[PDB]
Amino acid sequence: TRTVSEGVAHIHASFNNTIVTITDRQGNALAWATSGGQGFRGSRKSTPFAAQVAAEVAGKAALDYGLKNLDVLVKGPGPGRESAVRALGAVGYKINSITDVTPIPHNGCRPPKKRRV
Amino acid sequence: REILPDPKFSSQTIAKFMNHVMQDGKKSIAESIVYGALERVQEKNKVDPVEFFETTLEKVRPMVEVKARRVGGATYQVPMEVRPSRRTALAMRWLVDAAAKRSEKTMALRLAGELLDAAEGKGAAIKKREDVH
RNA sequence: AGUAUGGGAGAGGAUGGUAGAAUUCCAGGUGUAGCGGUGAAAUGCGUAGAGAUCUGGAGGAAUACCGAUGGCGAAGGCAGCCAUCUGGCCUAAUACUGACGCUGAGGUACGAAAGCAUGGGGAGCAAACAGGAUUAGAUACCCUGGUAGUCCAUGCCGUAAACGAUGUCUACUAGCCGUUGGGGCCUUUGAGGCUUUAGUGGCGCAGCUAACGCGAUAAGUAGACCGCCUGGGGAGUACGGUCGCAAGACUAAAACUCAAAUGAAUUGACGGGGGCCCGCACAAGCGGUGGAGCAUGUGGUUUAAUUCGAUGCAACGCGAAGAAC
């Protein structure tokens, strides 16, 4: 409805769950998708096979606005980090830049204790 | 282990298909059914079956198979590549059951019917073969 | 052994000022049904509006790379940047006092974390506490909430695997390969190369050791002094005495019991121990059992007996290749 066509994308990839959000350059949300609404409801949501579909269902909803300027921002390591862009490139989205924006803290608070088992 | 081609048509594919239809070593009753189905399908179109059976089987020939590998307690189903011989074996095992699934007078007539149905695409032998699966 | 001179390195210490990132909280914009977690689920949050993103504030801790086989310090200990005070060490010989040195029972100072007292603060983390799981039981390992503390300033406490499990000082005794601060020499011809010290590493000769190993930073050969040990448990415990707000700290036995308690190494075994290998062992394909009926054996009840054996794989179409006499 805006037809701005310069919306960035935020792919937050984690070991537990991944999130895709196509927003505008300013930051207002336009189309977001999660693995929860997919229907796996478990650790299978962390698989890249689910992350690619979660990114595609968001890309198809963002296509209603006519987005073709893709600026990707990835946060957090884990599986499914590469499946998002490999799924978005299959539909034919034009890519402008790919970089790592995962924030590393500079001497923050105390991390939790290491899991023994 | 290599098999000899049939003495009638000099084709090893027909011999391997007979080895897949044959049960309990009854080569005679399998050869009879195969020859009857061939002569029946030759009546719909006067075509030598050695040219048409290959087309019909490649119409249903699969590409990849899905097997499970245990790593951490999950299935993790992924497709894998195999030699074409395994795919022909799968196709033959798919055709030998689709003909029996039908209801007709003799096995030769229903086999010819299922083969003709899978030729044009109305048979279930190609339906059971799925790409995503 | 020490003094003054000109130079060099250093998380050495005390005081004061200052900043980024990150976490949490407080609003604002778009948006919003799932978010969070376990090998699996929930306790928890949210349609008031979940999660994520952007923008402005609030306060607390530390300072990602540099970072090292680093460096400084008597030990504990010391890492963001800047200003002041101050300590120690190294390097070149010039003169100087001329044995002025080492050790050191009592004594004294410093002394990890935790804790105690006094006035504040408290972001995150978290003893004790609550809820949700597994287990026959879970009181704990797991997750979700959370109080002291972790922080600042002033005192008490003097305790740790405060370990290099190796007291301080001095002189001697083959070598090979790196690092740190200096100096000198050779063509600084080039961050070059070679030697002398002061620290910090890895092998190794001889020698020592029961073995493991040490081996110019000795556990080798030698000297001076201090401390400490006389089988194990009892027991660093009772009593006593000193210190202390307390916790407790220091000094420190006896009765009794046993014929053991130890360190290293060898050969096996184990191992949920990291590999390696193989196995119709796991993968794949085909056909059965387990469902029905019958033959056969065994197990249980009964009778006069239902003759006796065989009992996980390795007993059960077994002894028996064949009970109407």
Q: What angle do CA A17, A19, A24 make, to 5 degrees?
A: 170
How far is the C-alpha of B55 from the C-alpha of A58, rounded, in Å?
Answer: 42
Give the phi and the psi of residue A75 in degrees, each rounded to 5: -135, 125
Distance, Å, A113 CA → C157 C1': 31
Answer whether any strand C atom is within 7 A of the Cβ of A17.
yes
| Entry field: residues in chain B | 133
Any idea where the domains of chain A sit in the sequence?
Answer: 4-117
Q: Are B21 and B30 in contact (CB under 8 A)?
A: yes
How far is the C-alpha of A9 from the C-alpha of A28, rounded, in Å?
Answer: 11
Q: Which two tokens stand for residue A9?
A: 């994308």
| Protein-nucleic contacts, chain A 26-85 to strand C, CB < 7 Å | 26-30, 32, 34-37, 42-43, 45, 75
Q: Are A22 and A5 in contact (CB under 8 A)?
A: no
Q: How was this structure determined?
A: cryo-EM
Residue A71 backbone zone (phi > 0: left; psi -120 to 50: alpha; other: beta)? beta
Protein-proximal positions, strand C, CB < 7 A: 20-23, 29-41, 50-54, 60-64, 123-126, 141-143, 283-286
How far is the C-alpha of A48 from the C-alpha of B78, rounded, in Å?
Answer: 13
Domain count, chain B: 1
How far is the C-alpha of A89 from the C-alpha of A68, rounded, in Å?
Answer: 11
Name the resolution in angstroms: 4.4
